[PDB]
Amino acid sequence: GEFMVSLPRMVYPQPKVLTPCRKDVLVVTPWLAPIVWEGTFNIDILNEQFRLQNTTIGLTVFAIKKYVAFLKLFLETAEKHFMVGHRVHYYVFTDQPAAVPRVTLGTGRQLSVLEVRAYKRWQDVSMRRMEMISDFCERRFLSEVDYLVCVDVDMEFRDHVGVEILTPLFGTLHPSFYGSSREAFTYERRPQSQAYIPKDEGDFYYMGGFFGGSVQEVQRLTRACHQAMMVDQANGIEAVWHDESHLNKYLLRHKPTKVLSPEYLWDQQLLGWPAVLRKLRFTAVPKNHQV
Amino acid sequence: GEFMVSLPRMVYPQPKVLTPCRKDVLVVTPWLAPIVWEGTFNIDILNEQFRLQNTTIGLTVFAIKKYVAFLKLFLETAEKHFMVGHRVHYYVFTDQPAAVPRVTLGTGRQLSVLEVRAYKRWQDVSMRRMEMISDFCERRFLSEVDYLVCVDVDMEFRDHVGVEILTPLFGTLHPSFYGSSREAFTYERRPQSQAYIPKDEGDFYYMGGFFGGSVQEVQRLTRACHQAMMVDQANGIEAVWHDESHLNKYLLRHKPTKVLSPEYLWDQQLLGWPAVLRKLRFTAVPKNHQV
Ligand SMILES: O=c1ccn([C@@H]2O[C@H](COP(=O)(O)OP(=O)(O)O[C@H]3O[C@H](CO)[C@H](O)[C@H](O)[C@H]3O)[C@@H](O)[C@H]2O)c(=O)[nH]1
Ligand SMILES: O=c1ccn([C@@H]2O[C@H](COP(=O)(O)OP(=O)(O)O[C@H]3O[C@H](CO)[C@H](O)[C@H](O)[C@H]3O)[C@@H](O)[C@H]2O)c(=O)[nH]1
Ligand SMILES: [Mn+2]
Ligand SMILES: [Mn+2]
């Protein structure tokens, strides 16, 4: 939120008030947050706005135990598609620093390897990211980046993922549930859990694999989710979908300022390529669950 | 931007991703700013969000010379429709403090009468609002309100105008031009003016009668428009639409974070009640121009 200088002259098509960009999908939430789909944004305008602020984006990714194998494709495709032209700082959290592949980066981009402990259960590995993002890295992130983007590693970039996502707080629509009614969402349904959401509440089902925002908002979210997980652990309960359950509770009670469409987290294997998706931007890589 | 506590449990209809709110109009700009139309927002959610921040809204209005006659209806209808339930501070700028009508206010609402000089030409009266809002009232507004809303007085509220409009910076689509191509917009077209916009630039034509934002953003806008008007005056040129021309230049170069639809500034006399308007919220009162 620093003083913003004027945009230069730009030549682009006039937005027309009586022509929607997209008529097939919801492009704004009932709390007036944009839902980001292809056709809703002019990337040239957004790139100008964010470049004029010299925006730095941090990207966090965890690669613990066998998941180090996903890093090469993840990082090489991020170089092709993630925030190209902007300052990027990758933060790779791993138990095997020597297994991080040497990936060639474009100018203005850097990578830090952060060693962490590996936990036995994949559920605990997934869940402990909230603590790792918040408690350990609070001060570093505040000094080094403007926004944090927190993603799964078992993924590849296939198309543009850029500054259109940046906002104080965002979540991403889970690709399996964007057409589902709220009663069908796999929220935590046990009232004994901090993640509990009743059947008559819920806006969306957000996937735990892609969330972000300003550093302050991300530290708030990760701190709250970590605290809620600790309460659950003390009470002998583990939410049905782990960190994702808590993320969903948080974003129900603290509405995101943008929502990313499932373009931003897709599984083509599983779900194909429906008409509503004009681009598949960030997609699941096969993982043979029982990695 | 203070710490935001959690929303309470709320029961409301689920937003459905594959059902747009409105298919007849553009509801988001190409820079991802919501365009505020009826059907795009859930006021209960927004009221909760803004009440939890104890939001105070300042409303500025100028009533100089014969325009004091418009104050009674303006203020009485604002009491019925403007930010009801929230803290409101009216700032009435006038050359005739004794002519301000005694209007009964709801709880949490206050009115201040600010005496100013009357200028001879209606164009100068209109134009000098930018200076009056910025230079004179900078410190007061920063201490007293969170958002400023700056409107014409020759108007009445007929329907809800609430926290859905609040954002760092907003303008309102001029009711005569929302369907027009940019070449038809009455921007200042002389390159000798600071307000100059070429025929191949422009997003929208914003009306000078309804704009606002955070206090900081409004002071930035009003300061920039005042400075630009002073440059024009020194160069012997007066923009075709005065302050409105400068407002349009500013919002071209500094994109608003929400845009209000013409629901928010309408003239039923002149334009009727088209199908695209589900509500007429803030409307022109007859003024017999040659007042
Ligand atoms: O042995 C492991 C297990 C997990 N992870 C990390 O944890 C992430 C999440 O695990 P998976 O990708 O195996 O799980 P899913 O793809 O099923 O994940 C979805 O469900 C999870 C909760 O069960 C999380 O919320 C996750 O973010 C969401 O995308 C991985 O991408 C990886 O970054 C590891 O590094 N090593
Ligand atoms: O003698 C006057 C003349 C003007 N005004 C103030 O200036 C405002 C703007 O003047 P008008 O309402 O007469 O002009 P329009 O309705 O045609 O205004 C439109 O065009 C103007 C520029 O020409 C401004 O930009 C204005 O905000 C925009 O709504 C008035 O509402 C009032 O608040 C007075 O108080 N007294
Ligand atoms: Mn995954
Ligand atoms: Mn007017």
XYZ file of C-alpha atoms and ligand atoms in Angstrom:
656
model
C 0.000 0.000 0.000
C 2.660 2.556 -0.950
C 1.979 5.682 -3.053
C 1.009 4.548 -6.521
C 2.215 6.479 -9.500
C 0.129 6.940 -12.569
C -0.272 4.302 -15.235
C 1.148 5.222 -18.630
C -0.978 5.578 -21.745
C -2.157 2.123 -22.876
C -4.152 1.008 -25.895
C -6.513 -1.881 -25.207
C -10.077 -2.864 -25.903
C -12.799 -0.889 -24.146
C -14.664 -2.768 -21.495
C -18.333 -2.727 -22.425
C -20.815 -2.443 -19.636
C -23.630 -4.267 -21.487
C -21.317 -7.160 -22.513
C -20.229 -9.529 -19.670
C -16.760 -11.093 -19.995
C -18.156 -14.520 -19.015
C -21.880 -15.464 -18.885
C -21.334 -19.131 -17.988
C -19.763 -18.669 -14.550
C -19.941 -16.554 -11.397
C -17.162 -13.945 -11.628
C -17.745 -12.136 -8.300
C -18.608 -13.528 -4.860
C -21.564 -12.177 -2.797
C -18.979 -10.257 -0.710
C -17.660 -8.557 -3.868
C -14.454 -10.551 -4.305
C -13.518 -11.308 -7.903
C -13.499 -14.960 -8.948
C -10.572 -15.235 -11.339
C -11.367 -16.890 -14.677
C -9.824 -16.451 -18.093
C -11.559 -13.571 -19.886
C -12.145 -11.551 -16.683
C -8.808 -9.745 -16.642
C -6.513 -7.716 -18.852
C -3.074 -8.906 -17.852
C -1.351 -5.918 -19.388
C -3.167 -3.545 -17.036
C -2.482 -5.772 -14.037
C 1.173 -6.253 -14.925
C 1.601 -2.473 -15.131
C -0.079 -1.957 -11.756
C 2.028 -4.555 -9.972
C 5.306 -3.719 -11.703
C 4.853 -0.027 -10.706
C 4.824 -1.238 -7.066
C 7.959 -3.457 -7.675
C 5.983 -6.370 -6.311
C 7.875 -9.381 -4.920
C 6.058 -12.698 -4.712
C 7.183 -15.498 -2.420
C 6.186 -19.062 -3.333
C 6.322 -21.703 -0.630
C 6.464 -25.404 -1.422
C 7.131 -28.445 0.756
C 9.039 -31.421 -0.584
C 9.418 -33.947 2.197
C 10.548 -37.550 1.860
C 9.694 -38.982 -1.601
C 8.044 -35.723 -2.717
C 11.485 -34.259 -3.534
C 11.042 -36.076 -6.863
C 8.387 -33.520 -7.882
C 10.630 -30.475 -7.502
C 12.354 -30.476 -10.893
C 9.151 -30.300 -12.949
C 7.471 -27.998 -10.438
C 10.292 -25.439 -10.521
C 11.092 -25.666 -14.235
C 7.456 -25.101 -15.165
C 7.148 -22.309 -12.549
C 9.967 -20.610 -14.412
C 7.915 -20.803 -17.609
C 4.583 -19.678 -16.179
C 4.627 -18.238 -12.645
C 4.804 -14.452 -12.266
C 7.179 -14.095 -15.232
C 8.555 -10.544 -15.310
C 8.036 -9.998 -11.612
C 10.353 -10.597 -8.649
C 9.968 -14.127 -7.274
C 11.472 -15.796 -4.257
C 10.956 -19.546 -3.989
C 11.098 -21.077 -0.508
C 11.591 -24.828 -0.751
C 11.059 -26.593 2.588
C 12.615 -30.043 2.622
C 14.191 -32.720 4.774
C 16.720 -33.426 2.002
C 18.488 -30.196 0.949
C 20.900 -32.211 -1.274
C 17.985 -33.630 -3.259
C 16.794 -30.188 -4.419
C 17.495 -30.089 -8.194
C 19.679 -27.293 -9.616
C 17.113 -25.348 -11.659
C 18.123 -22.424 -13.825
C 16.201 -19.273 -12.915
C 15.299 -16.196 -14.925
C 16.558 -12.793 -13.825
C 15.017 -11.287 -10.673
C 14.192 -14.704 -9.257
C 15.778 -16.547 -6.364
C 15.459 -19.802 -4.474
C 16.124 -20.585 -0.808
C 16.274 -24.105 0.585
C 14.913 -24.341 4.122
C 15.629 -27.554 5.973
C 12.843 -28.964 8.130
C 12.045 -32.163 9.981
C 10.197 -34.989 8.212
C 7.202 -36.454 10.053
C 6.208 -40.134 9.589
C 2.563 -39.740 8.532
C 1.780 -37.936 5.253
C -1.173 -36.307 7.092
C 1.221 -34.737 9.643
C 3.593 -33.663 6.864
C 0.663 -31.929 5.128
C -0.671 -30.421 8.379
C 2.635 -29.110 9.764
C 3.032 -26.715 6.788
C 0.815 -24.180 8.581
C 3.173 -24.049 11.561
C 6.235 -23.981 9.325
C 4.883 -21.089 7.228
C 3.800 -19.032 10.264
C 5.944 -19.636 13.402
C 9.350 -20.266 11.801
C 9.315 -17.878 8.816
C 7.261 -14.855 10.070
C 10.113 -12.368 10.172
C 11.885 -13.535 7.015
C 8.798 -13.279 4.793
C 7.882 -9.823 6.080
C 11.369 -8.562 5.166
C 11.650 -10.295 1.778
C 8.325 -10.415 -0.085
C 5.023 -8.554 -0.502
C 2.778 -11.564 -1.148
C 3.002 -15.242 -0.270
C 1.638 -18.041 -2.465
C 1.502 -21.448 -0.779
C 1.153 -24.512 -2.984
C 1.444 -28.272 -3.229
C 4.552 -29.691 -4.918
C 2.870 -32.629 -6.740
C 1.990 -30.247 -9.521
C 3.114 -28.552 -12.713
C 2.423 -25.196 -14.323
C 0.970 -25.491 -17.825
C -0.199 -21.926 -18.429
C -0.049 -18.418 -17.048
C -0.290 -17.918 -13.279
C 0.370 -14.249 -12.643
C -0.452 -11.131 -10.728
C -4.191 -11.506 -11.363
C -4.173 -13.765 -8.251
C -2.613 -11.202 -5.920
C -4.819 -9.653 -3.235
C -4.818 -9.536 0.561
C -6.251 -13.060 0.902
C -7.161 -15.746 -1.647
C -8.269 -19.335 -1.849
C -8.816 -21.618 -4.810
C -11.946 -23.564 -5.743
C -11.325 -27.286 -5.352
C -11.682 -28.874 -8.806
C -13.854 -31.777 -7.565
C -16.445 -29.564 -5.837
C -16.987 -26.333 -7.773
C -20.382 -27.577 -9.038
C -21.422 -29.179 -5.730
C -24.028 -28.048 -3.229
C -22.681 -27.137 0.180
C -24.182 -30.171 1.908
C -21.967 -32.349 -0.375
C -18.764 -30.478 0.551
C -16.357 -32.583 2.611
C -16.032 -30.025 5.379
C -15.307 -31.339 8.864
C -18.796 -32.207 10.226
C -17.979 -33.212 13.835
C -18.845 -30.373 16.284
C -15.951 -31.501 18.506
C -13.453 -30.189 15.892
C -12.379 -26.572 15.553
C -12.840 -27.052 11.782
C -16.555 -27.891 12.176
C -18.907 -26.381 9.582
C -22.634 -27.233 9.734
C -24.543 -28.419 6.662
C -26.294 -25.054 6.165
C -23.033 -23.024 6.107
C -20.309 -22.651 3.518
C -19.647 -20.574 0.419
C -17.154 -22.785 -1.449
C -14.889 -25.770 -0.926
C -11.331 -24.422 -1.155
C -8.419 -26.764 -1.919
C -5.591 -26.830 0.549
C -3.027 -26.904 -2.255
C -3.216 -23.279 -3.433
C -3.810 -20.299 -1.119
C -2.068 -16.992 -0.467
C -2.266 -13.286 0.059
C -0.262 -10.491 1.612
C 2.331 -11.663 4.069
C 0.286 -10.321 6.942
C -2.865 -12.116 5.868
C -1.080 -15.361 5.191
C 0.628 -15.247 8.596
C -2.809 -14.624 10.169
C -4.331 -17.565 8.344
C -1.502 -19.994 8.997
C -1.278 -18.987 12.664
C -5.040 -19.459 13.140
C -5.060 -22.822 11.345
C -2.033 -24.034 13.352
C -3.662 -22.955 16.655
C -6.934 -24.687 15.669
C -5.048 -27.900 14.741
C -3.289 -27.826 18.127
C -6.635 -27.526 19.925
C -7.946 -30.514 17.942
C -4.813 -32.552 18.770
C -5.223 -31.778 22.501
C -8.870 -32.937 22.204
C -7.936 -36.215 20.429
C -9.446 -35.376 17.041
C -7.893 -34.948 13.568
C -9.990 -33.127 10.965
C -11.236 -35.245 8.038
C -9.092 -33.356 5.521
C -6.420 -32.087 7.821
C -5.067 -28.641 7.023
C -7.637 -28.298 4.232
C -10.490 -28.625 6.723
C -9.043 -25.808 8.817
C -8.340 -23.653 5.781
C -12.010 -24.019 4.850
C -13.164 -22.989 8.292
C -10.861 -19.971 8.240
C -12.021 -18.793 4.799
C -15.663 -19.228 5.805
C -15.123 -16.850 8.764
C -12.611 -14.545 6.995
C -13.790 -14.066 3.456
C -11.058 -14.093 0.782
C -10.610 -10.912 -1.242
C -10.216 -12.986 -4.457
C -11.184 -16.548 -5.258
C -9.261 -18.475 -7.919
C -11.260 -20.613 -10.323
C -10.330 -24.265 -10.826
C -8.118 -23.215 -13.756
C -5.621 -22.662 -10.955
C -5.773 -26.175 -9.461
C -6.910 -28.913 -11.831
C -6.476 -32.647 -12.305
C -6.883 -33.543 -15.988
C -6.543 -37.201 -15.374
C -9.377 -37.315 -12.994
C -11.616 -34.543 -14.397
C -10.785 -34.044 -18.051
C -11.125 -30.622 -19.686
C -14.657 -29.241 -19.284
C -16.044 -26.402 -21.385
C -16.017 -23.990 -18.464
C -12.175 -24.188 -18.314
C -10.549 -22.155 -21.051
C -7.093 -22.764 -19.607
C -5.581 -25.407 -17.345
C -2.918 -23.426 -15.480
C -1.598 -25.496 -12.563
C -2.280 -29.211 -12.660
C -1.810 -32.421 -10.723
C 1.073 -34.716 -11.570
C 0.459 -38.452 -11.022
C 1.636 -39.478 -7.529
C 0.627 -43.153 -6.871
C -0.704 -42.238 -3.405
C 0.463 -45.271 -1.353
C 5.034 -41.877 -2.559
C -6.913 -2.339 7.774
C -7.038 -3.318 11.454
C -7.143 -6.933 12.711
C -10.422 -8.442 11.605
C -12.256 -10.764 13.907
C -14.180 -13.719 12.660
C -17.637 -13.481 11.172
C -20.363 -15.214 13.162
C -22.368 -18.139 11.831
C -24.759 -16.906 9.117
C -27.430 -18.692 7.113
C -27.754 -17.474 3.536
C -28.059 -18.898 0.067
C -25.025 -20.678 -1.354
C -23.301 -18.887 -4.157
C -23.281 -21.198 -7.155
C -20.251 -21.142 -9.354
C -22.104 -22.222 -12.529
C -24.882 -19.618 -12.003
C -23.869 -15.941 -12.584
C -25.651 -13.328 -10.443
C -26.198 -11.110 -13.514
C -25.751 -12.204 -17.173
C -26.902 -8.913 -18.721
C -24.105 -6.658 -17.456
C -20.367 -6.558 -16.777
C -19.883 -7.138 -13.033
C -16.059 -6.931 -12.874
C -13.646 -4.575 -14.644
C -10.607 -5.874 -16.618
C -8.458 -4.849 -13.609
C -10.581 -7.049 -11.316
C -12.612 -4.325 -9.614
C -16.225 -5.233 -8.899
C -18.898 -3.232 -10.710
C -21.682 -2.868 -8.166
C -25.144 -3.860 -9.409
C -28.148 -5.209 -7.567
C -27.885 -9.005 -7.358
C -24.064 -9.012 -7.079
C -23.862 -8.617 -3.310
C -25.231 -10.070 -0.104
C -25.704 -7.034 2.089
C -25.913 -9.081 5.256
C -22.374 -10.383 4.758
C -21.073 -6.919 3.897
C -22.843 -5.265 6.814
C -21.261 -7.796 9.183
C -17.795 -7.200 7.731
C -18.008 -3.424 7.986
C -19.765 -3.315 11.354
C -17.021 -5.581 12.824
C -14.528 -2.837 11.836
C -16.800 -0.081 13.374
C -16.646 1.698 10.049
C -17.347 5.450 9.940
C -18.402 6.980 6.639
C -18.074 10.684 5.913
C -20.374 12.198 3.276
C -19.408 15.524 1.759
C -21.917 17.753 0.004
C -21.704 21.341 -1.227
C -24.701 23.640 -1.059
C -23.664 27.046 -2.317
C -25.952 29.928 -3.226
C -29.397 28.687 -4.392
C -28.393 25.025 -3.973
C -29.107 25.259 -0.219
C -32.716 24.556 -1.251
C -31.759 20.943 -2.061
C -30.430 20.120 1.405
C -33.667 19.179 3.165
C -34.634 16.409 0.734
C -31.025 15.307 0.299
C -30.450 14.861 4.038
C -33.873 13.456 4.928
C -33.604 10.796 2.234
C -29.961 10.080 3.208
C -31.311 9.294 6.653
C -33.669 6.744 5.103
C -31.196 5.085 2.748
C -27.512 5.963 3.226
C -25.379 3.614 5.333
C -28.223 2.966 7.795
C -26.848 1.126 10.835
C -23.343 2.437 10.351
C -21.626 5.546 11.730
C -22.106 8.538 9.424
C -20.693 12.021 9.547
C -22.188 14.520 7.114
C -20.022 17.487 6.117
C -22.167 20.210 4.583
C -20.092 22.935 2.905
C -22.082 26.115 2.403
C -21.909 29.880 2.134
C -25.140 30.149 4.151
C -24.831 28.212 7.439
C -28.213 29.623 8.618
C -29.960 28.142 5.584
C -29.004 24.554 6.492
C -32.298 22.842 7.475
C -32.603 21.214 10.920
C -32.830 17.532 9.957
C -33.449 14.851 12.544
C -30.728 12.198 12.493
C -30.730 8.558 13.530
C -28.407 7.384 16.286
C -24.675 7.240 15.493
C -24.970 9.960 12.871
C -23.765 13.541 12.983
C -23.688 16.644 10.831
C -21.113 19.442 10.653
C -21.688 22.699 8.803
C -18.520 24.059 7.211
C -18.678 27.619 5.961
C -16.946 28.373 2.670
C -16.773 31.184 0.146
C -19.254 31.316 -2.745
C -17.771 31.841 -6.214
C -19.748 33.672 -8.949
C -19.668 31.061 -11.730
C -21.392 27.697 -11.149
C -18.408 26.088 -12.954
C -15.996 27.507 -10.332
C -18.330 26.457 -7.512
C -18.322 22.905 -8.922
C -14.551 22.914 -9.548
C -13.447 24.346 -6.187
C -14.878 21.307 -4.324
C -11.648 19.402 -5.026
C -9.569 22.031 -3.230
C -12.083 22.304 -0.404
C -12.154 18.528 0.161
C -8.349 18.164 0.055
C -6.450 21.283 1.270
C -8.842 22.544 3.962
C -10.192 19.294 5.457
C -7.214 16.846 5.197
C -6.523 16.562 8.909
C -10.143 16.579 10.076
C -11.235 13.724 7.799
C -8.262 11.548 8.727
C -9.166 11.894 12.422
C -12.939 11.454 12.051
C -13.859 8.933 9.343
C -12.595 5.805 7.567
C -14.131 6.463 4.143
C -15.234 9.594 2.319
C -18.166 9.721 -0.111
C -18.375 12.913 -2.169
C -21.663 13.715 -3.879
C -23.771 16.345 -5.588
C -26.559 17.963 -3.555
C -29.175 18.227 -6.360
C -30.174 14.676 -5.602
C -32.286 12.367 -3.474
C -31.859 8.846 -2.148
C -34.653 6.499 -3.218
C -33.172 3.129 -2.277
C -30.321 1.488 -0.429
C -26.838 3.004 -0.708
C -24.648 1.107 1.724
C -21.329 -0.457 2.497
C -21.247 -2.358 -0.805
C -19.724 0.861 -2.257
C -16.834 1.066 0.202
C -13.333 0.322 -1.089
C -10.066 2.239 -1.368
C -11.193 4.170 -4.464
C -14.466 4.254 -6.418
C -16.153 6.104 -9.225
C -19.656 5.868 -10.623
C -20.725 5.201 -14.210
C -22.347 8.301 -15.678
C -25.967 7.416 -16.506
C -25.871 9.027 -19.981
C -22.772 7.130 -21.164
C -22.714 3.598 -19.748
C -23.664 2.138 -23.161
C -21.427 4.486 -25.179
C -18.200 3.741 -27.013
C -15.161 5.559 -25.700
C -14.860 7.845 -28.720
C -18.330 9.242 -27.788
C -17.319 9.993 -24.178
C -17.122 13.719 -23.434
C -13.601 13.552 -22.062
C -11.451 16.654 -22.452
C -9.976 16.271 -25.982
C -7.590 19.268 -26.143
C -3.945 18.157 -25.601
C -3.237 21.525 -23.947
C -5.343 20.458 -20.910
C -4.092 18.287 -18.067
C -7.417 16.412 -18.372
C -6.697 15.388 -21.991
C -7.649 11.823 -22.952
C -7.138 10.674 -26.566
C -9.906 8.951 -28.529
C -8.307 5.492 -28.196
C -8.062 5.642 -24.365
C -10.654 5.352 -21.633
C -12.402 2.599 -19.702
C -15.597 4.373 -18.590
C -17.098 7.833 -18.291
C -17.396 8.513 -14.552
C -19.811 11.164 -13.254
C -18.363 13.891 -11.118
C -21.320 13.720 -8.737
C -20.504 10.485 -6.885
C -16.964 9.338 -6.026
C -15.170 8.231 -2.872
C -12.870 5.831 -1.137
C -10.621 5.682 1.889
C -9.671 9.058 3.245
C -6.148 8.636 1.964
C -7.258 7.780 -1.549
C -9.799 10.555 -1.685
C -7.229 13.101 -0.486
C -4.858 11.816 -3.206
C -7.512 12.159 -5.877
C -8.754 15.576 -4.820
C -5.208 16.914 -4.430
C -4.230 15.654 -7.903
C -7.388 17.040 -9.528
C -6.931 20.419 -7.785
C -3.262 20.609 -8.891
C -4.240 19.698 -12.481
C -7.000 22.367 -12.494
C -4.477 24.956 -11.270
C -2.092 24.058 -14.104
C -4.949 24.454 -16.607
C -5.916 27.839 -15.103
C -2.295 29.063 -15.377
C -2.330 27.931 -19.045
C -5.634 29.735 -19.820
C -7.765 26.631 -20.352
C -10.826 25.265 -18.502
C -11.688 21.603 -19.084
C -14.931 20.929 -20.990
C -16.596 19.338 -17.958
C -14.604 20.971 -15.237
C -13.885 18.813 -12.208
C -15.526 15.850 -13.951
C -12.968 15.994 -16.759
C -10.131 15.842 -14.241
C -11.796 13.089 -12.241
C -11.976 11.060 -15.454
C -8.314 11.590 -16.196
C -7.376 10.587 -12.656
C -9.462 7.390 -12.708
C -8.043 6.442 -16.108
C -4.494 6.608 -14.666
C -5.403 5.301 -11.170
C -7.908 2.529 -11.597
C -10.769 2.477 -9.061
C -11.022 -0.583 -6.828
C -14.839 -0.638 -7.298
C -17.050 0.946 -9.919
C -20.654 1.827 -9.067
C -23.303 1.074 -11.667
C -25.713 3.805 -12.757
C -28.152 2.614 -10.071
C -26.048 4.923 -7.920
C -26.468 8.080 -10.030
C -29.567 8.183 -12.219
C -31.886 10.744 -13.775
C -35.351 9.232 -14.260
C -36.693 12.267 -15.952
C -34.128 12.213 -18.622
C -33.480 8.452 -18.932
C -36.505 6.589 -17.639
C -36.142 3.180 -15.979
C -34.370 0.705 -18.276
C -34.462 -3.054 -17.768
C -30.819 -3.184 -16.737
C -31.613 -1.089 -13.606
C -33.282 -3.149 -10.916
C -33.099 -0.277 -8.443
C -32.802 3.492 -8.758
C -30.828 4.396 -5.630
C -29.656 8.016 -5.864
C -31.407 10.217 -8.386
C -31.438 13.700 -9.851
C -33.894 16.261 -8.544
C -35.125 18.849 -11.078
C -32.925 21.976 -10.936
C -33.948 24.386 -13.781
C -30.284 24.923 -14.737
C -30.281 28.683 -15.529
C -30.622 27.921 -9.770
O 5.270 -37.316 2.092
C 4.830 -36.154 1.839
C 3.473 -35.874 1.906
C 3.029 -34.578 1.632
N 3.915 -33.612 1.292
C 3.541 -32.230 1.015
O 2.171 -32.027 1.375
C 1.455 -31.670 0.187
C 0.034 -32.197 0.300
O 0.006 -33.621 0.175
P -0.555 -34.324 -1.140
O -0.191 -33.446 -2.339
O -0.097 -35.758 -1.099
O -2.140 -34.378 -0.863
P -3.365 -33.944 -1.813
O -2.850 -33.580 -3.199
O -4.473 -34.975 -1.654
O -3.654 -32.643 -1.008
C -4.864 -31.995 -0.737
O -5.272 -32.457 0.555
C -4.354 -32.236 1.651
C -5.027 -32.526 2.993
O -5.336 -33.916 3.111
C -3.763 -30.832 1.644
O -4.715 -29.913 2.204
C -3.334 -30.392 0.247
O -2.806 -29.079 0.271
C -4.491 -30.515 -0.721
O -4.055 -30.057 -2.010
C 2.304 -32.199 -0.970
O 2.006 -31.562 -2.233
C 3.684 -31.893 -0.467
O 3.949 -30.500 -0.678
C 5.288 -33.927 1.239
O 6.138 -33.057 0.935
N 5.694 -35.185 1.498
O -24.511 27.309 -7.587
C -24.062 26.152 -7.326
C -23.578 25.329 -8.332
C -23.081 24.066 -8.002
N -23.087 23.648 -6.713
C -22.565 22.357 -6.278
O -21.867 21.735 -7.362
C -22.545 20.512 -7.672
C -22.402 20.244 -9.162
O -23.198 21.156 -9.923
P -24.533 20.679 -10.650
O -25.196 19.615 -9.773
O -25.297 21.923 -11.021
O -23.985 20.088 -12.043
P -24.314 18.688 -12.766
O -25.419 17.956 -12.015
O -24.445 18.947 -14.260
O -22.936 18.064 -12.398
C -22.130 17.164 -13.105
O -21.175 17.966 -13.809
C -20.338 18.838 -13.015
C -19.200 19.416 -13.856
O -19.713 20.295 -14.860
C -19.784 18.146 -11.776
O -18.658 17.335 -12.148
C -20.843 17.314 -11.056
O -20.294 16.671 -9.921
C -21.473 16.325 -12.013
O -22.433 15.541 -11.287
C -23.964 20.687 -7.129
O -24.657 19.433 -6.934
C -23.684 21.413 -5.846
O -23.239 20.462 -4.871
C -23.580 24.509 -5.713
O -23.593 24.160 -4.509
N -24.062 25.720 -6.055
Mn -1.302 -32.407 -3.860
Mn -25.736 17.548 -10.029
